């Protein structure tokens with residue numbers, strides 16, 4: 001149970017605008033989330049997520065999200081990205097942020113009068129996967145491997161970020177990465193914990209594009225997707 005928090009995702013704005021009772025509830029399931037991180041089709045969730053609870057498709061803008069960039073950054077700029085995991089839904093696993101560098105695909109997700117098809121959502125996923133923002137692109141950022149994976153397996157990569165293991169120190173799972181206080185960010189079910197990293201933005205410019213957050217659960221056959229509207233100029 002989780003969603004992207006910084007920069008403010010469509011999921012965050014959705015909650016803050018009164019529309020989304022459970023921002024953390026945008027789940028893709030059932031899927032094989034593990035150990036092949038990119039195998040599972042995104043179906044209806046797409047790169048921005050679909051919230052079954054409130055029946056919100058975030059892949060399309062409304063009056064409350066997706067109208068314009070929430071934040072503007074510079075090409076190649078190193079930025080803070082944060083997601084929020086629920087106290088009762090810390091599934092461990094691995095997460096990544098991506099930018100699709102094909103504007104004609106992303107445009108289909110910036111029009112309030114158009115809902116992208118399942119075909120377009122998958123095309124975008126594929127584009128986003130080409131535009132993954134590796135942990136290791138930020139100099140000085142320590143990029144560990146998953147305690148729930150072994151060398152050679154499809155999950156054994158450190159372009160993606162990893163949560164801590166379950167049986168780990170006294171900093172387990174995704175909460176353990178920041179080891180922040182409860183309610184360091186908002187979730188509706190049991191209160192939230194921040195999970196904070198850095199990414200380096202591409203030398204790719206847009207007045208309006210997306211960062212798509214993807215969390216592949218270890219504990220569960222579930223994926224969590226959010227997107228944030230940004231500019232790189």
Ligand SMILES: *[C@@H]1O[C@H](CO)[C@@H](O)[C@H](O)[C@H]1NC(C)=O
Pocket residue numbers: 205206207232233
């Ligand atoms: C954004 O839009 C304005 C007006 O068209 C333009 O001057 C600016 O240079 C654009 N930057 C982009 C597309 O990155």
Ligand SMILES: [Cl-]
Pocket residue numbers: 037038039129214
């Ligand atoms: Cl993926």
Ligand SMILES: [Zn+2]
Pocket residue numbers: 001002089090091222
């Ligand atoms: Zn969950």
Ligand SMILES: [Zn+2]
Pocket residue numbers: 015016186
């Ligand atoms: Zn609130």
Ligand SMILES: [Zn+2]
Pocket residue numbers: 037038125126129
């Ligand atoms: Zn993918």
Ligand SMILES: [Zn+2]
Pocket residue numbers: 036037038039154
């Ligand atoms: Zn794969």
Ligand SMILES: [Zn+2]
Pocket residue numbers: 067068069110207208
């Ligand atoms: Zn726009």
Ligand SMILES: [Zn+2]
Pocket residue numbers: 072073074077
């Ligand atoms: Zn800046």
Ligand SMILES: [Zn+2]
Pocket residue numbers: 073074075232233
């Ligand atoms: Zn600039």
Ligand SMILES: [Zn+2]
Pocket residue numbers: 103104107
């Ligand atoms: Zn365009």
Ligand SMILES: [Zn+2]
Pocket residue numbers: 119120
């Ligand atoms: Zn088609």
Ligand SMILES: [Zn+2]
Pocket residue numbers: 122123126
């Ligand atoms: Zn494909």
Ligand SMILES: [Zn+2]
Pocket residue numbers: 142143
């Ligand atoms: Zn190191």
Ligand SMILES: [Zn+2]
Pocket residue numbers: 035148149150153
């Ligand atoms: Zn395994």
